[PDB]
Design a protein around this ligand. Structure first.
Ligand SMILES: OC[C@H]1O[C@H](OC[C@H]2O[C@H](O[C@]3(CO)O[C@H](CO)[C@@H](O)[C@@H]3O)[C@H](O)[C@@H](O)[C@@H]2O)[C@H](O)[C@@H](O)[C@H]1O
Length: 432
């Protein structure tokens, strides 16, 4: 029932954060937090997959293992140096009765993308820079002004979450440059990512207590991110631990398509697996605003046009599974429902608000989420339905991602608006 047709998910066991995202030697590499042993978190390794086109994933052998039963290979990033692939990651030691957990930052190298060797000088960063630092992890490394820069997530005095910055000329010797950013609404920050998009420094980061990916855009000046604008990267319930790819022109982000808060509510563990990755999105700046849209490569998934209409109504779709894309252009207000006789997801544009309701979606129920949006002459929704998810994209500007678990095919579509142009495309199964 719930195995995705065109999203990445593990062949068995548990998966969370996307790691080591890199375009290397002509192919997109994606690693991930992985426990093959069972559909729950534990004994974490880095799984590995590859695609030519950000869509057609193929599983590779597990890339990184912990050395023993009391450690984990926590999240991190990937870069290219001297033609070789380097992975930079947090190595985690379990707490014991006398000791708290210990986190260090380490480096691994690969000349072929298949075999990975450990740097002899590990750990590359052996301890936190200040006292009272906890959750010291998730190194995201990029190039800036002739130098390597690393951002790390952290928490200070069990009170305020901060992003720490280190620099390096060679990827092995790092210098602490202070806390560039803090968010007082959380005790810790996960999975930071500092990118540059058109004259602007953008800090992407995750907060575990609301399970949200936020951003702060502005200018790094004198060791501090001067924030001009703030927001969410995604407005739904299931988008977490976002990371962007190294080595591409566009900024391309993938997130974990799941929530820590709602993990115990989901049914895939019965099938022997847990965890799904989001579709990739391009992040870009237009009119001094950060915008999110689906990557262009997703168009290749479109097989045959199952349905189309230029008027409102309720329609039976000729689809045999939950694997399709709704493309909908409209003016004014809209109500779009997708579902069957027992289940539905509803998205409504009511005045200056976009609202999504997955409470009736399937066997994990759901929630209601909303965002205020700018009016346009013509609006556009793209909705990607797969076996256990729906991702909505609006005006190439914002995204809402939700995990849903329908017991049956969503073969009924209802639209109510003026000036509607709606199409449905079957989406290809990438596996078989
Ligand atoms: O306090 C120990 C903690 O261990 C487990 O969770 C670890 C960690 O997982 C999450 O952080 C990320 C982001 O999703 O996931 C990887 C680990 O796989 C981290 O590198 C990265 O920061 C959560 O978001 C954190 O709050 C959490 O500490 C276990 O699952 C917890 O119950 C707890 O025992």
């Amino acid at each position: 029932l719930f195995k995705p047709n065109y999203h990445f998910f593990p062949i068995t066991g548990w998966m969370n954060d996307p790691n080591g995202l890199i375009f290397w030697k002509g192919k997109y590499h994606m690693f991930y937090q992985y426990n093959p042993r069972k559909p729950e978190w534990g004994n974490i390794c880095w799984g590995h997959a590859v695609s030519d086109d950000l869509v057609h994933w193929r599983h590779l052998p597990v890339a990184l293992y912990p050395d023993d039963e009391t450690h984990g290979v926590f999240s991190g990033s990937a870069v290219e140096k001297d033609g070789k692939m380097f992975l930079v990651y947090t190595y985690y030691r379990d707490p014991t009765h006398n000791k708290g957990e210990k986190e260090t930052q380490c480096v691994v190298m690969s000349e072929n993308g298949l075999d990975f060797v450990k740097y002899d000088g590990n750990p590359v960063i052996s301890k936190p820079p200040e006292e009272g630092t906890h959750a010291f992890r998730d190194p995201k490394v990029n190039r800036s002004n002739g130098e390597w820069r690393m951002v790390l997530g952290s928490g200070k005095d069990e009170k305020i979450g901060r992003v720490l910055l280190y620099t390096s000329d060679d990827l092995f010797h790092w210098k602490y440059e202070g806390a560039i950013f803090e968010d007082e609404t959380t005790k810790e920050i996960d999975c930071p990512d500092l990118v540059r998009i058109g004259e602007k420094d953008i800090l992407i980061y995750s907060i575990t207590s609301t399970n949200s990916v936020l951003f702060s855009m502005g200018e790094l000046k004198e060791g501090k991110l001067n924030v001009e604008k703030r927001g969410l990267l995604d407005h739904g319930t299931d988008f977490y631990a976002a990371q962007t790819f190294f080595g591409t022109d566009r900024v391309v982000v993938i997130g974990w398509l799941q929530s820590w808060l709602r993990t115990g509510l989901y049914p895939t563990k019965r099938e022997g697996w847990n965890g799904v990755m989001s579709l990739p999105r391009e992040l870009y700046v237009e009119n001094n605003e950060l915008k999110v849209k689906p990557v262009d490569e997703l168009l290749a998934l479109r097989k045959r046009k199952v349905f189309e209409t230029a008027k409102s109504g309720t329609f039976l779709l000729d689809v045999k599974e939950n694997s399709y894309e709704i493309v909908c252009e409209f003016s004014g207000e809209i109500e779009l429902r997708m579902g069957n006789e027992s289940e539905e997801v509803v998205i409504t544009k009511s005045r200056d608000e976009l609202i999504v309701d997955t409470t009736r979606s399937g066997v994990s129920g759901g929630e209601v989420r909303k965002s205020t949006v700018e009016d346009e002459a013509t609006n556009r929704i793209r909705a990607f339905l797969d076996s256990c998810s729906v991702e909505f994209f609006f005006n190439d500007s914002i995204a809402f991602s939700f995990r849903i678990h329908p017991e049956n095919v969503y073969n009924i579509l209802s639209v109510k608006s003026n000036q509607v142009k709606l199409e449905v495309f079957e989406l290809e199964n990438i596996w078989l």
